[PDB]
Design an enzyme around this catalytic site. Structure first.
Site, PDB file in Angstrom:
ATOM      1  N   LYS A   1      18.663  67.598  54.434  1.00 35.48           N
ATOM      2  CA  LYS A   1      19.429  67.606  53.120  1.00 35.48           C
ATOM      3  C   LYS A   1      18.900  66.412  52.321  1.00 35.48           C
ATOM      4  O   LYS A   1      18.041  65.702  52.906  1.00 35.48           O
ATOM      5  CB  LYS A   1      20.880  67.362  53.519  1.00 35.48           C
ATOM      6  N   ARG A   2      19.343  66.207  51.083  1.00 33.92           N
ATOM      7  CA  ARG A   2      18.832  65.031  50.328  1.00 33.92           C
ATOM      8  C   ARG A   2      19.363  63.755  50.993  1.00 33.92           C
ATOM      9  O   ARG A   2      20.488  63.677  51.523  1.00 33.92           O
ATOM     10  CB  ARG A   2      19.290  65.052  48.858  1.00 33.92           C
TER      11      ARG A   2
ATOM     12  N   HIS B   1      31.153  70.225  41.106  1.00 32.09           N
ATOM     13  CA  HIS B   1      30.356  70.115  42.307  1.00 32.09           C
ATOM     14  C   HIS B   1      30.509  68.830  43.093  1.00 32.09           C
ATOM     15  O   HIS B   1      29.884  68.713  44.159  1.00 32.09           O
ATOM     16  CB  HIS B   1      28.797  70.165  41.913  1.00 32.09           C
TER      17      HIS B   1
ATOM     18  N   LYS C   1      25.783  60.910  52.710  1.00 37.60           N
ATOM     19  CA  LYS C   1      25.380  61.881  53.706  1.00 37.60           C
ATOM     20  C   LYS C   1      25.342  61.268  55.092  1.00 37.60           C
ATOM     21  O   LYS C   1      25.488  61.994  56.064  1.00 37.60           O
ATOM     22  CB  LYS C   1      24.198  62.695  53.363  1.00 37.60           C
TER      23      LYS C   1
ATOM     24  N   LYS D   1      23.960  77.646  56.375  1.00 36.54           N
ATOM     25  CA  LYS D   1      22.660  78.240  56.825  1.00 36.54           C
ATOM     26  C   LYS D   1      22.436  78.152  58.322  1.00 36.54           C
ATOM     27  O   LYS D   1      21.922  79.052  59.036  1.00 36.54           O
ATOM     28  CB  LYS D   1      21.549  77.436  56.078  1.00 36.54           C
TER      29      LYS D   1
HETATM   30  C1  LIG Z   1      20.612  74.521  51.346  1.00 37.06           C
HETATM   31  C2  LIG Z   1      19.717  73.503  50.886  1.00 37.06           C
HETATM   32  C3  LIG Z   1      20.202  72.277  50.470  1.00 37.06           C
HETATM   33  C4  LIG Z   1      21.761  71.946  50.497  1.00 37.06           C
HETATM   34  O1  LIG Z   1      21.849  71.356  51.846  1.00 37.06           O
HETATM   35  P1  LIG Z   1      23.286  70.487  52.133  1.00 37.06           P
HETATM   36  O2  LIG Z   1      23.039  70.194  53.538  1.00 37.06           O
HETATM   37  O3  LIG Z   1      24.457  71.309  51.691  1.00 37.06           O
HETATM   38  O4  LIG Z   1      23.193  69.298  51.275  1.00 37.06           O
HETATM   39  C5  LIG Z   1      19.349  71.277  50.022  1.00 37.06           C
HETATM   40  N1  LIG Z   1      18.045  71.593  50.026  1.00 37.06           N
HETATM   41  C6  LIG Z   1      17.450  72.720  50.409  1.00 37.06           C
HETATM   42  C7  LIG Z   1      15.943  72.988  50.391  1.00 37.06           C
HETATM   43  C8  LIG Z   1      18.307  73.724  50.834  1.00 37.06           C
HETATM   44  O5  LIG Z   1      17.757  74.913  51.279  1.00 37.06           O
END
Ligand SMILES: *Cc1c(COP(=O)(O)O)cnc(C)c1O
Ligand SMILES: *Cc1c(COP(=O)(O)O)cnc(C)c1O
Lengths: 823, 823
Positions: free
Chosen positions: A550-551, A359, A556, A662
């Site tokens: 995102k986190r 990952h 990031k 998404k």
């Molecule tokens: C999809 C999702 C993530 C992954 O988001 P990235 O932008 O790929 O890091 C993290 N947290 C939540 C709640 C998600 O729905």
């Protein structure tokens, strides 16, 4: 709707309020109402769940076991209804009973069992595996506490316990009857027949099952999550006095194993507690697997002895990251020590059974366990592991005669004044397949970190671009959208996202274009309002909603976005009577407690908002908001409401990303680097249909070769330079002048992500964003090109690939027959 | 039976196996079957439970709150069916489904929430209060671990955790929605308006309700037991870092409050943990009470202000022992500090509301808390308490002018190089009524320990002889018996035990006599067999079953019985060809861990059995068995099967006893001292109809005056003397000669219970027992006189007394109307 069914649902709702909840209509709260609906939907699910399982029993297919320490499921009610197609009826049913279902849904707490990407992936998988008719099982840990609720106080993140089971969990089913023992500590005794693991301390693993319904196919698979329970006697056994009462209290120690999820994302922490978690999931899980193999239609299978040679023909174990890597020596241990199979024979089996997904390439995320930790906790496992290494290095040796560094490089054991075990090497060695989650990620794995491995066995390395579930991620969160599309091409696309392409036909289609933009505005209005109700907003609905969720992490580059934002504030403040595209910039995500920098970052965002939102010269124009407690349920509300997705990780850091995907489906245009999956996304939609920018991988590498000097940027870019001085001088922290002098140091002397190096191109690409937005019809046609081209990113294609190229199974679209039981 | 109902029950059983348990008939275990029946019976209970409560709401009667740290309920399934009269139907229903209900019942684990008498009493009460239509509530703590499971290993008791909720508890109903905060620690700030309790640490009290159905009256009251939960933030609050994870783990500390029941019976241990338990029950309970008062039909009750003057008119709080004594200053605290009532006014209220029951005179059982313990944990409570004392001693002073010792004697505060609070004095001072549980006990209370108190306020002291519930204790455990009696006089006696007297008419009644003896033999056969199945027995069914079951204690004198038994073995061994009445002597009961002597005692029993059961010269003749893990469910099987009840406590030690009464109703003759309730029992049945012996109270007192010398007995009685030497010489512990030289020391130099002083008369009365048994018809007529005369011992007369003379309520035999809800 549909009248009989509606009659039924109303009836059952009434039955559970009374019987199950033991409440009366003069006393029920929306909370009771919520639980009463949950238990009604849940009934609709049992016969199918029971049937599915019964079916696998006598049908005896190869089973897929998806091992993960994280299952980030979110809420289940809406999603079960979608999948069971009870959504409308439930709606009617609750209408007539007079309730506002949507209002009831908000009462459900998320099942926050993961940290972000890796755990959300596991959750999408299960839904895909179920929709595709695979006999698959997700195995994890039932944490009493998932990822913490994030509070923001005086600009800072305050973490509070995610007490998710407070009010109960209607979807699971305790299975105290299938509790199995897990062993820890002890010592080994090599004797006669072979080795024995003794004088171990035991913890019981108790399973809880949750149903996972496929999309309208009458299939319901199982998610089995273990709970730690202390044995009944040592916890009052031995010569073992020292307090009867205190001994009773001491049970905590032990049940502590499943108390909470470690809140680190892409970060490895060498704590014993985590290692116990990893061992516990694996040990309990493997018994279940073996149990199932031996008792199944082999239930009979008399004489080889009990054969394992057929093991790989009936079982596949998928390692989500190296977290569950112990499954490798644990399988050898049992096969060997308990089943008395020759190493050779067992190794073969193990190999053919295990598959591992990587990952990330970030070094800090990799698991390297102090052997001193293993020696103690799992003495037999370290012995096994040493054994694998030997045999493994005897193979390289043969392959690369004399190649003395390679040996050192591929060893599972890192000697180095803190001898550690590299979990990733153990995993490649013991698995028949290894995959990256984005083709670029996959290519870099084989070009770098695992170069040696690839050279030894090219055949083991694959790629499996990640995906997302169109159920949760379209149908559930954006029904307006699914609708407008359904009208046009109908519905076979919910289980065949690819058909979204026939959507290219309406790009130049004006009734289409107006629908698309219309659903987009509605979503927007619904988000803005939610903002207000639930907090204090007063957000500009006719503004470009620029979101980065995102986190929080350095890689990031929430910081680069921060840079973007102050620039904007700065240009405005400089020539304020000049018209600009209004924007509402939203950023949210959790930072692991103790990732000091991540904490600093949030504060910086809050800091900017404190300034920007209270400048009268700014007006409607710029709004900066920190979205508190971002998690599955929040993602479902903000994604559909966004216009621009910020996917801007330094190329080569983000393995794939999924928040990625998404936004593409809920119609947002993407601003990003050529990192992870963005590469493929841009690829599918056309580069002209994406807002690409910055250095590519080769670029980064070429800069590192040079040696990176942020001073040069600072030196060459006025705009940037002014932001610095403002960060530096107390511009954003009056009270505390030097508050951010920390991010500055980092930006300036040690930015491993070269924020400054992509600043100019980023600001430039952003102008282009703004330009397009001033032309509605044109922003919408592009978006159409994005939605249209998103089908490749469904988790169904992903799962179909794993099935075929690693599991050796065949997905089915075939509907379980399955209504039920009458007489 | 009764066909429709049977149709229904079969239907519902089927529904819950599927839906609730999520199991199929190809997979269910008797355990599943058990749970499926439990959930069917439970449904029959909801409408009534809901209705009852609704009824009290708008009917607004005075409510009775029974506060106890122990509720020793046993199993609930049989008992709910008896009470709901579903027993036969359930039987049919399960027949046709083909299951053996009785077999299903054994799967239910006891709710072992108490230690013995005090907790069993509370459980009988609730059933009596429900059968009598009172609006009563039992409040306690939901311990995760009740009294420990007792194992016997190599002759010793091994304690293991009573993990009673493993598989779930179908009878309770979590009420997370009514969680209230409980405060601990802090400091006080006397300021302006008055005192404030601050910077306290908070624990949440979460309620779980269990229904308590009355005997066929459509009434179901509630048993609310609190569970300790940690708040969501400190447990991650404050500046409060030190590990996010560790802070999460630290929640245990706090939830530790309801983890387990302290396993001491008639023994006080000054542990902080226990005091937190006592404070926690009381604080949470009082809020509920106040909540209910203010919101009820006062729900309106506008202007006095909010009146408390009516408090005692709507509420009664019954303190079961001093355990919950903190309710006193806790009520003052709230009334005063929170409600801003003048002391005088609040005290008055408190007094009129509280009533306390004393359960023992043994000094070691009395609660005397180190003030240093209070000062810390509950600073505001110690202030209040000091205040009560002052005011209290100002009253004596006035009454007994100059009486300086009395002052010191009645003080709630024992100054003495470990200043302590006497919980008993606080309780008499703050309550309008105080009762002993046996008239003798009651008389001694007022003649001794509380002499001073009585003199100050004679009017406060009462008597309320304890009772037992004829439901559990006759109907449920001895249906043969209830039957034979029903045939004769029918059934109004289950809720009017007094009618048992009309039974005198069949003493001289031969079909009667044969029935009575016949049911007795059946019970016996059923016990003997159970013995065997479940263990290894080979017990003599045509032997006199001599049983002594209760907690192991010195005051109980299991030792004297031990003496009886070796004598018997000794006479036999001396003139073995001589005929004697065969006997199976059974002794069982739990000893608190660490009550070294109690442990020594058990071992001694096992020791005797080791010898006696393996002497070929003994034969059929003598059998000694230690009954392992005696608790509610075991009492239900052994009591009905016994012939002679050993109730032989040194006169003046046993306050009442209740095992007492259970044996009288299941037809056993009683061998005992004139102690506790035996006095009244003998009284009601006629002294010629009991096997009385030993010193009376005055006798003990007269010996103590002399000064007790066991040497004199030893010296004057050969039989006794020989037992000594055998204990002393290793007769019963070959391996370990000196094992019992400990009991010897005690017997000989420090027996506070003067075992030896009642030895001669005991052995003598026992011969008389044996004599009567050789004449069946005569042993049975006597027994008849016992059963016939037992009605006074039902908990219904007991509760009727409390109701009328302390609570000021009126029992009702009136049936709630109450079927349900259709449309
Ligand atoms: C999809 C999702 C993530 C992954 O988001 P990235 O932008 O790929 O890091 C993290 N947290 C939540 C709640 C998600 O729905
Ligand atoms: C009734 C009962 C008791 C009280 O017995 P005594 O002989 O009065 O001490 C103790 N334990 C259990 C299980 C009981 O049923």
């Amino acid at each position: 709707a549909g009248v009989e069914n509606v009659t039924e649902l109303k009836k059952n709702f009434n039955r559970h309020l009374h019987f199950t909840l033991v409440k009366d209509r003069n006393v029920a709260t929306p909370r009771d109402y919520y639980f009463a609906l949950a238990h009604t939907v849940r009934d609709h699910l049992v016969g199918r769940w029971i049937r599915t399982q019964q079916h696998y029993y006598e049908k005896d297919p190869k089973r897929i076991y998806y091992l993960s320490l994280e299952f980030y499921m979110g809420r289940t009610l809406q999603n079960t209804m979608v999948n069971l197609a009870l959504e409308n009826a439930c709606d009617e049913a609750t209408y007539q009973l007079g309730l506002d279902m949507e209002e009831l849904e908000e009462i459900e707490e998320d099942a926050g069992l993961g940290n972000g990407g890796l755990g959300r992936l596991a959750a999408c998988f299960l839904d895909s595996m179920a929709t595709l008719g695979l006999a698959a099982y997700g195995y994890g840990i039932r944490y009493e506490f998932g990822i913490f609720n994030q509070k923001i106080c005086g600009g800072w993140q305050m973490e509070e316990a995610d007490d998710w089971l407070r009010y109960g969990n209607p979807w699971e089913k305790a299975r105290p009857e299938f509790t199995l023992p897990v062993h820890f500590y002890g010592r080994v005794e090599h004797t006669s027949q072979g080795a024995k693991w003794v004088d171990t301390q035991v913890v019981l693993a108790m399973p809880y099952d949750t149903p996972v319904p496929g999309y309208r196919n009458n299939v319901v698979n199982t998610m089995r999550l273990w709970s730690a329970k202390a044995p009944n006697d040592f916890n009052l056994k031995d010569f073992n006095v020292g307090g009867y009462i205190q001994a009773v209290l001491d049970r905590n120690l032990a049940e502590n194993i499943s108390r909470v999820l470690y809140p680190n994302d892409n970060f490895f922490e060498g704590k014993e507690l985590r290692l116990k978690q990893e061992y516990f999931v694996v040990a309990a899980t493997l018994q279940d697997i073996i149990r199932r193999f031996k008792s199944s239609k082999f239930g009979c299978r008399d004489p080889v002895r009990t054969n394992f040679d057929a093991f790989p023909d009936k079982v596949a174990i998928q390692l989500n990251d190296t977290h569950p890597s112990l499954a490798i020596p644990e399988l050898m241990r049992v096969l060997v020590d308990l089943e008395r199979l020759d190493w050779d024979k067992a190794w073969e089996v193990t190999v053919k059974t295990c598959a591992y997904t990587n990952h990330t390439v970030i070094p800090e995320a990799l698991e390297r366990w102090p052997v001193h930790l293993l020696e103690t906790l799992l003495p037999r496992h370290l012995q096994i592991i040493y054994e694998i290494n030997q045999r493994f290095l005897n193979r390289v040796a043969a392959a690369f005669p004399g190649d003395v560094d390679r040996l050192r490089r591929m060893s599972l054991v890192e000697e180095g004044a803190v001898k550690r075990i590299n979990m990733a090497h153990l995993c490649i060695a013991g698995s028949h397949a290894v995959n990256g989650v984005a083709r670029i990620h996959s290519e870099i794995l084989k070009k770098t970190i695992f170069k040696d491995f690839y050279e030894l066995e090219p055949h083991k390395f694959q790629n499996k671009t990640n995906g997302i579930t169109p159920r949760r991620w379209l149908v559930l969160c954006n029904p307006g959208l699914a609708e407008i599309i359904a009208e046009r091409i109908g519905e076979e696309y919910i289980s065949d996202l690819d058909q979204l392409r026939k959507l290219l036909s309406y790009v130049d289609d004006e009734a289409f274009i107006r629908d698309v933009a219309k659903v987009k505005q509605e979503n927007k209005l619904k988000f803005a309002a939610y903002l207000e109700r639930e907090y204090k907003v007063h957000i500009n609905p006719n503004s470009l909603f620029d979101v980065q969720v995102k986190r929080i992490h350095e890689y990031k580059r929430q910081l680069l976005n921060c840079l973007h934002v102050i620039t904007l504030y700065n240009r405005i403040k400089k020539e304020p009577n000049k018209f600009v595209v209004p924007r509402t910039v939203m950023i949210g995500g959790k930072a692991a407690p103790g990732y000091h920098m991540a904490k600093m970052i949030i504060k910086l965002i809050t800091a900017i908002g404190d300034v920007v939102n209270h400048d009268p010269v700014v007006g409607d124009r710029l709004r900066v908001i920190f979205l508190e407690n971002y998690r599955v349920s929040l993602a479902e509300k903000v994604i559909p409401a966004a216009d621009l997705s910020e996917q801007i990780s330094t190329a080569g850091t983000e393995a794939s990303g999924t928040g990625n995907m998404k936004f593409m489906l809920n119609g947002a245009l993407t601003i990003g680097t050529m990192d992870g999956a963005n590469v493929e996304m841009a690829e599918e939609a056309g580069e002209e249909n994406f807002f690409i920018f910055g250095m590519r991988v080769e670029d980064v590498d070429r800069l590192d070769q040079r040696g990176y000097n942020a001073q040069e940027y600072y030196d060459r870019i006025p705009e940037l330079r002014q932001i610095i001085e403002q960060l530096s001088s107390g511009f954003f922290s009056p009270k505390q002048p030097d508050l951010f002098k920390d991010i500055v140091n980092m930006l300036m002397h040690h930015d491993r992500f070269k924020v400054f190096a992509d600043y100019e191109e980023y600001v430039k690409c952003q102008e282009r964003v703004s330009a397009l937005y001033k032309n509605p019809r044109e922003w919408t046609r592009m978006v159409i090109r994005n939605i249209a081209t998103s089908g490749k990113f469904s988790s169904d294609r992903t799962i179909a690939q794993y099935a075929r190229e690693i599991w050796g199974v065949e997905p089915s679209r075939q509907r379980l027959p399955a209504p039920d039981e009458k007489i």
